[PDB]
Amino acid sequence: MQIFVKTLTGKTITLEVEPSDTIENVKAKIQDKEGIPPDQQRLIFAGKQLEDGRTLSDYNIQKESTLHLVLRLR
Amino acid sequence: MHRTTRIKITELNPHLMCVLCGGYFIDATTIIECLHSFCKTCIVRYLETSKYCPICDVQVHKTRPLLNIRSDKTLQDIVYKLVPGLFKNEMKRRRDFYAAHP
Amino acid sequence: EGFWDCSVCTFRNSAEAFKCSICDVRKGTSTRKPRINSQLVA
Amino acid sequence: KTWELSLYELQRTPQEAITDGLEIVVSPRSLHSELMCPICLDMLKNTMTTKECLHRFCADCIITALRSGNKECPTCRKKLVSKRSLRPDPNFDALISKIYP
Amino acid sequence: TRKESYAIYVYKVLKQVHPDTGISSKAMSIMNSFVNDVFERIAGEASRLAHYNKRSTITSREIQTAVRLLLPGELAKHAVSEGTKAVTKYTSA
Amino acid sequence: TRKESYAIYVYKVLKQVHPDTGISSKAMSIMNSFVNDVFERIAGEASRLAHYNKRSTITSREIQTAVRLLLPGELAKHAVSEGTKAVTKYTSA
Amino acid sequence: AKAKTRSSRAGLQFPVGRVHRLLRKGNYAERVGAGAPVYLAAVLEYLTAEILELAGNAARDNKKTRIIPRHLQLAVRNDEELNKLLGRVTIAQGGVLPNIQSVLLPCK
Amino acid sequence: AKAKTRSSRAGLQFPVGRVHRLLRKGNYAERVGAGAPVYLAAVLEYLTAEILELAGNAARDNKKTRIIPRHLQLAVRNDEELNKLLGRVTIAQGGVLPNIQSVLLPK
Amino acid sequence: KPHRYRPGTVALREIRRYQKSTELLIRKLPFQRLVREIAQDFKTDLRFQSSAVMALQEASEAYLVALFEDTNLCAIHAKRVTIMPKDIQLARRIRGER
Amino acid sequence: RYRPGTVALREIRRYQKSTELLIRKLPFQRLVREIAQDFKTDLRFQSSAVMALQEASEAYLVALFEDTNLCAIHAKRVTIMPKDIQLARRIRGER
Amino acid sequence: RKVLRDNIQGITKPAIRRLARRGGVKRISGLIYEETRGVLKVFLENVIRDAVTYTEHAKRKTVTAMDVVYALKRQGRTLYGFG
Amino acid sequence: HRKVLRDNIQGITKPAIRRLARRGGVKRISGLIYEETRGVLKVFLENVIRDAVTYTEHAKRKTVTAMDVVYALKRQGRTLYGFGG
DNA sequence: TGGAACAGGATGTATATATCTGACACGTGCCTGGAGACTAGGGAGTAATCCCCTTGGCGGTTAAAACGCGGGGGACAGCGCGTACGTGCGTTTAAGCGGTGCTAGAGCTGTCTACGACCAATTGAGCGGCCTCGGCACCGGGATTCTC
DNA sequence: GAGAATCCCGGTGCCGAGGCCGCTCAATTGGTCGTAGACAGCTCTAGCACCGCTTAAACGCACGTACGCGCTGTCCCCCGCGTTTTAACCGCCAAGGGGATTACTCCCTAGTCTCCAGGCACGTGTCAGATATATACATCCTGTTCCA
Ligand SMILES: [Zn+2]
Ligand SMILES: [Zn+2]
Ligand SMILES: [Zn+2]
Ligand SMILES: [Zn+2]
Ligand SMILES: [Zn+2]
């Protein structure tokens, strides 16, 4: 199960994620492979911003899904 | 090398006279739009009533005709050297004018 | 009318919002959508 | 400004013209520095005068000097833009004509 | 004497787009100047085209080419579409 | 078909100024383009002025004002002088 | 013979007849066609609608109800193609877009 | 009567009649006055003579009996007023003026 | 010691305020007097509509603001934060006015 | 061998004394055709049109390099670097 | 009427500083004021000469906002809002 | 009948860029100037050629002419002398 | 030991002659555009009148400009290093030249037809004047935010 | 944490934005007529594709050096603040200059016809000039030499 994350710089990065994984793990590997601090990341999918305590299966995110990343400096 | 020349002064007097006053060039200033030379007093008195050259009637300036007139030491020395005696007559006149009114 | 979708980040904006709540991109005309080559991440 | 008439100038009478039948004699060095062209250092011919500084030059001399470069007056360093800043001087041409034929 | 302007048509368009918004006199004057300037630009381009091609008449083709030459990108594309639609409607009715 | 150009008159003026100097074809083409550009600029300015003052005629006053607006300084002065001299010579006949 | 305006004929808000008259009287060509005024009016109306929509959005984003030159300037200078079209135009009472070079701004 | 050209009448070398025709057929105004072409022809002749004289000067200076675009470019760019008039104009085969910044010179 | 702001903070505050504001920044009567004196050379006994001097002032301030933006860019390019006449001259020369 | 700079100065004098074109004609023609392919297919070109395009391009680049040199000297350097081009174009108003 | 001499001193240092602040300038040297005065004088000279030429061709004695607009348009400084 | 043309900007060689810089009066050139110049030239050519092709297509022709190029350059403010007009 | 001065070898470059050559300048036929005469109708010059708006002056009221002070931050100069660029050489690539052939398409000519200018009658759209009530400038008071 | 700036809220006033009515002139509708151009046909030219050859120019590599880029230190010159002063601004009045409109008439330019010579396409002889060859002068650099 892979996902695609698109940045505001036109960069699409492929991640190997499990549907049961929570977004905490998602941004964990985001920092691991990109160095983006957790507080600067906002996730957009299906016209809604993901809630902190929710996991992918709640949002019914399927294979080859594209999620948009927004960076806001803190 | 040119030689020493003696010439009639009536030959160049018409080309050395001042039209407005009829006398020799004293403090000669020239209008630069047409390059026409006159006595400073003559041209400054005329310029307060007209904005055109007395000779060729060309517009000297649109607003301030005094802005295009320049005093010419060249023709000054030309007259002082070509004609004899004006320098003595003139400085005697200034001294005898200043000898009574300080 | 109904909620309008953002062109830049696709997050659904309310009909009363004229700049995006996340990316603060001015809403475009009904015919011309706003472009992306305007600013950067920072 | 810088043109107000002085107490002498406002009422001075014209200098009477000398109409007597006398000749004038000039040496070839009487008018030397007054008639020397600053460029060629020779007797002036086809004289041209600048509008702003009223400095006389030989026509060919000033044309060549301006073409070469340094668009300022060779005598007073004041800038002149082109040939249009100069006027011919038939007065001086006639003067040198009778003076040294 | 009368002084013609585009104020009524600008107000009609404004009411069509934003039903609840007004416009001040200075803004209306800016709009009038903008319309006049654009009109002048397009007409000059069309006249130059017609003179270049040895033509004595200005047509919708010349106007379309002038619009393409002047307006950038998407503006030119949509303006051409609107002009073609208006011409087709006028010719049909 | 014949194509008109100012080559003959350019050559006449060149022979008037420099009797023993010739001109190449590329230089002549450049001079022709220069003359056309100046003519177009002056004519456009005169037409704009005539439209501004609500006139239907282009006259020597419009030409003179356009020349003063376009040419800088001494060039404009000498051009005005030559134009007035030519006009008075033509009308005094 | 009921009179129907050409603007209503082509479904436009702009004065097709006035545009035709101005084209005729403007010394652009010896003669003008029939569709040229319609095309020009449609283009002018489209541009006006674009400008007015952007200005209205900008104005009511500020929570006002009147378009002002500041709103017009903001719309024009914030739309890329409109700014390219009006690059050499100065709008009275418009001001400038707020922008400060980051070098001048302090940071950490 | 014998036909006497308007150019000869006004003492000009330029085609007053052709200028009048171009003014009439150029869509500039509804009516064109009689004295308008003479003024324009005289102005064009004066400008041509100015540049041609400068071009000829540069040509004979370089010892080139013939004016070339290089001579035209030198004449135009060496005069401030002509350069300002032709600021946005490119002359083919004209080259550039010889000019190097003093800071670039060897110390 | 009383309150003492470090240099620059008031500068950024003024920058923000004047970038938010839209009014004219030059005095009306001095600008009008300058305009009339400049116009004295071309014609004499001229008269001006108020809208004419208003348009002149608007154009003048717009031109000056654009020139100062270009000068600031030149100054930042030269690794400085202070604008200088060299920056102004370079900006004008590149623009083509000199 | 010469120190650096002498050959550069000689090249500057040589290329400022002459008026010939400095770009290879066939590569320029191929580039022009490739660029034109994106607008209309199967076009034809006149040799004079290609020559005019080349002249305009070279004049534009020469002017841009002059402005770049001015910027580089302003920044207290003698080497031209891309930010000089960027600043020159931004001030000219092309970007 | 008065000779009206020495008027370009009325563009004051605080006004020049305000214009610079609107332009986004943080630090100003001491000679910028003289430089700005010179530049403004040149700009005004050009625009006024063009406007007065238009007015004189119109055979009037009053300079109009439309004349100013025409001068600015000729110079490439197109201005909106004044007709 | 042609298929596709590519890498024709490369034909604008580094020695040619150095020659242009020398005519411009540049003494020392960095390494990225070549790429920057290639991009700038590509943009300029794109604009001019687009305008010229628009003129040609309006003329209902299939050959781009020097008059079309001159008209495009004049429209862009780059008046060019020597090729007609 | 270095640093200023100088001589000799190498290289670019203007100068002095001879080649030959392709473009410049001149002569000719003719045909189309410019000149001479004449008419007529409207654009524009000229004179008179109205009243709109520009100029000039006055008196308060402050808002803003001018002047001086202390100090900290930024501009400028000197130093060191190591990295990117100029210079030179040998090899490889392909551009420029001269020639051939084919044909798509630009350019010119005849026709005839549909389209736009021009004139009349008219009637409704748009401009001028008036009037009113709500949106925005300014007022004051808290509350929040940014600096030092 | 103290202090100055600026957002947030609520009142108040006032003036101009928008709606309404009358008139008049300009856009509609209808018809005619002359010619601009749309289409078909033909010609010939110049743009494209190809060939081979020669050598000019681009490529790749190596080396030394000089110049860009921190880093430090100093000192001087803008910045921020307080106090004095000055003239900008606003409200008011008054006069007349000239911008804007109207009416009359006259003369100047468009349009038509006829005539004819000025300039353009075409053809051709000759010399200005690019190119080649050789030479002496101005630049440039490194190695050597004398003084500190
Ligand atoms: Zn005179
Ligand atoms: Zn006298
Ligand atoms: Zn968004
Ligand atoms: Zn002098
Ligand atoms: Zn001499």
For chain F, domains (ranges, CATH) are 1-93 (1.10.20.10)
In sequence order, the β-bridge partners of residue D18 are: none
B55: Cα within 13 Å, side-chain hemisphere: 12
Show me where the domains of chain L are located: 2-85
AA letter at J8 = A
Distance CA H58, CA H51 (A): 11
In angstroms, this model's resolution equals: 2.8
Q: How far apart are CA C28 and CA C37, in angstroms?
A: 14
* DSSP state for residue D43 in the 8-state scheme: B
- Write out the residue range of the structural domain in which residue D37 sits: 32-99
Q: What is the DSSP pairing of strand A41-45 with strand A12-16?
A: unpaired
Residues A73 and J80: their CA atoms lie apart, in Å, by 35
Helices (DSSP H) in chain F: which residue ranges?
Answer: 7-17, 25-52, 60-70, 74-91
Architecture in CATH for domain I3-98? Orthogonal Bundle (1.10)
Cβ contact E–L (≥3 pairs, < 8 Å): yes
> What residues does G91 pair with on adjacent strands?
K80
Nearest DNA or RNA nucleotide to G24 (CA to C1'): M117
Q: Does domain L2-85 have CATH number 3.40.50.2000?
A: no
Give me the residues paired with residue A4 across strands. Answer: A14, A66
| Rounded Cα distance, E93 and G6, in Å | 10
Q: How many CB atoms lie within 10 A of CB I68?
A: 25
Report whether D34 contacts D100 (CB < 8 A): no
Q: Are G17 and G25 in contact (CB under 8 A)?
A: no
3-state helix, strand, coil in chain C (%, to 5): 0, 15, 85
SS3 label, residue F71: coil
DSSP state of K61: S
- The answer to whether the C-beta of H107 is closer than 7 A to strand N is no
The I-side interface with G (CB below 8 A) comprises 12, 15-16, 19-22, 55, 58-59, 62, 65, 72, 76, 81
In terms of CATH architecture, what is K1-83?
Answer: Orthogonal Bundle (1.10)
Q: Which amino acid is at A43?
A: L
User: J1 CA to M89 C1', in Å?
Assistant: 13
Q: Using an 8 Å Cβ cutoff, are H91 and H76 in contact?
A: yes
- For residue I73, which of J71, K40, L24 has the smallest C-alpha distance? J71
H30 with G29: Cβ contact below 8 A: no
How far apart are the CA of D6 and the centre of ligand 4, in A? 27
**Strand M contacted by I12 CB (< 7 A):** yes
SS3 of residue E88 by DSSP: helix
d(CA B95, CA J64): 68
Least CB–CB distance from C9: residue in A9, A70, A73: A70
Q: d(Cα J86, Cα L22) in Å, to the nearest integer?
A: 19
Ligand in nearest proximity to the CA of B43: 2
I82 touches strand N (CB under 7 A): yes
CA neighbor of H60 nearest in space, from F21, F12, A1: F21
Alpha-carbon distance of K15 to K37, in angstroms, equals 11
The pair of structure tokens assigned to E74 is: 């998407």
Q: Are strands B5-8 and D23-26 parallel, antiparallel or unpaired?
A: antiparallel
Tokens (6 digits) for J44:
């034809």
Distance CA D7, CA D15 (A): 17
- Backbone phi, then psi, for C37, in 5-degree steps? -80, 60
Q: Specify whether the CB–CB gap between I70 and K58 falls below 8 A.
A: no
What residues are paired with D43 via a beta bridge? D36
Q: Does nucleic acid strand M have an atom less than 7 angstroms from the CB of J74?
A: no
Query: Is E81 strand, coil or helix?
Result: helix
Contacts with C10 from chain A: Cβ below 8 Å: 44, 47, 68
**With an 8 Å Cβ cutoff, is B51 touching chain I?**
no
Residue J55 in tokens: 């002249």
The technique is: cryo-EM
Beta carbons of K71 and K54 less than 8 angstroms apart = yes
Whether residue J79 contacts residue L28, with contact meaning beta carbons closer than 8 Å, is answered with: yes
Dist. CA F48–CA F67, nearest whole Å: 13
Domains assigned to chain G:
6-85 (1.10.20.10)
Coil vs helix vs strand at B101 = coil
Chain E contact for C29 (CB, 8 A cutoff)? no
Q: How far apart are CA G46 and CA E79, in angstroms?
A: 7
Q: Report the number of distinct structural domains present in chain A.
A: 1
Q: Which residues, other chains included, contact J74 with Cβ-Cβ below 8 Å and sequence gap of 6+?
A: I74, I77, I78, I86, I90
- Are H67 and F21 contacting, i.e. CB atoms less than 8 angstroms apart? yes
Q: Tell me the CATH number at A38.
A: 3.10.20.90
Domain extents in chain B: 9-98
> Smallest CA–C1' separation from L59: which nucleotide?
M106
**DSSP symbols for chain L:** ------S-STTS-HHHHHHHHHHHT-SEE-SSHHHHHHHHHHHHHHHHHHHHHHHHHHTT-SEE-HHHHHHHHHHTT--EESS--
Minimal CA separation from G1 to chain C, in Å: 39
CATH class of domain segment(s) B9-98:
alpha beta
Does any domain span residue C38? no
Kindly state the tokens that stand for B10: 């009536």
- Closest Cα in chain D, distance from residue B61 (Å): 14
| CA G81 to chain centroid | 12
Task: State whether K68 and I45 contact (CB < 8 Å).
Answer: no
- Would you identify the CATH topology of the domain J1-95? Histone, subunit A (1.10.20)
D33-to-B81, D43, D95 alpha-carbon distances in Å: 12, 10, 15
CB J87 within 8 A of CB I71: no
Tell me how far the alpha carbon of residue H61 is from its chain's centroid: 20
What CA–CA distance (Å, rounded) separates K20 from G73?
20
D50 lies in some domain: yes
Within-domain flag for C36: no
CATH number at residue D51: 3.30.40.10
Structural tokens at position A62: 């399927």
| Per-residue flag: J30 CB under 7 A of strand N | no
